[PDB]
């Protein structure tokens, strides 16, 4: 409507919306090291 005060517009073809585009890569991780991710290797040496 701000541009419509300056120049004329016809009837639009279709309404155009704004949406969000983002890919979803995701991924996997084995638990043999990620299961002990709170347990840092300094604490591994402390427990050893």
């Amino acid at each position: 409507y701000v541009r419509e005060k300056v120049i004329d517009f016809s009837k639009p073809f279709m309404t155009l919306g704004i949406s969000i585009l983002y890919r979803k890569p995701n991924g996997t991780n084995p638990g043999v090291f990620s299961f002990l991710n709170p347990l840092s290797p300094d604490i591994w040496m402390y427990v050893l």
């Binding site: 991710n37 709170p38 347990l39 840092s40 300094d42 604490i43 402390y46």
Partner: peptide, 28 residues
Amino acid sequence: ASALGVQNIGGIFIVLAAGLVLSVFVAV
């Protein structure tokens, strides 16, 4: 953030070492 030790866990190993030394000192 993630998890660590040191700040409050880092002094419990002093209690562990002192308890081991005191238990050896009783066991003599």
